[PDB]
Design a protein around this ligand. Sequence first.
Ligand code: SAM
Length: 255
Amino acid sequence: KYLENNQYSDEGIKAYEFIFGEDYISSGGIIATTKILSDIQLDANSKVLDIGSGLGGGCKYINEKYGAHVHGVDICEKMVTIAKLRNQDKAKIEFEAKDILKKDFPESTFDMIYSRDSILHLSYADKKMLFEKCYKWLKPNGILLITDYCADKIENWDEEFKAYIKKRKYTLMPIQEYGDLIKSCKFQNVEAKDISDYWLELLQLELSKLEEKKEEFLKVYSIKEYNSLKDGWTRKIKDTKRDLQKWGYFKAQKM
Ligand SMILES: C[S@@+](CC[C@H](N)C(=O)[O-])C[C@H]1O[C@@H](n2cnc3c(N)ncnc32)[C@H](O)[C@@H]1O
């Protein structure tokens, strides 16, 4: 019976940047981004869409690494304003505040559509609608590259996990089911992989760095935000170990 700040509350966004690192508000920050993109091929003429672009870290990284044009879409105007402010000097990056479900792009626009821990905000029906849109928006041979939270079957959920999902308003499904949804939208070369052991390593590292810097955190943020972060990572670590909360990797191609 308490009022909990929502995930992207003013303080929540700042706290996520503290734990994930500057410009990022999802798993593994720049470290995971480097790894996820380590076999991805793009150049200065490539066009990339980032679905759920947040504070802009991913767009910044992709443009810096490849020189690619990057277009980030995020439903949160406040984040889009931040991303724009921080990347004014990058002419080939643009950000737009919109619900991706209300976006259209022409057929064959993007060499890559990229999304990191954002599609969890969408209902199953909306995920399907989005993947149908993504299929259209990709160029021939274009790549869809996603990480997203996934979960064990609902009957294996316990009380705390259910409370977490409700609070966050997430819609989480198992990895195979997510891959099958992508396949059903005609994507080919579909890879749907459980990378929860790598997620575990990132969670452990993130928490260890938070605890190391507790005094630093407490100079600017609340001890309630501190314990909320700490307890939240503690639960994610526990729940990934028993295969309840999962991290999914999905790569697919339009052929
Ligand atoms: C966990 S954050 C990750 C952001 C960024 N990809 C990152 O890794 O730092 C998920 C993002 O999804 C965005 N989002 C949620 N629903 C959306 C929608 N319908 N359209 C576009 N973005 C959405 C949120 O505003 C949030 O910034």
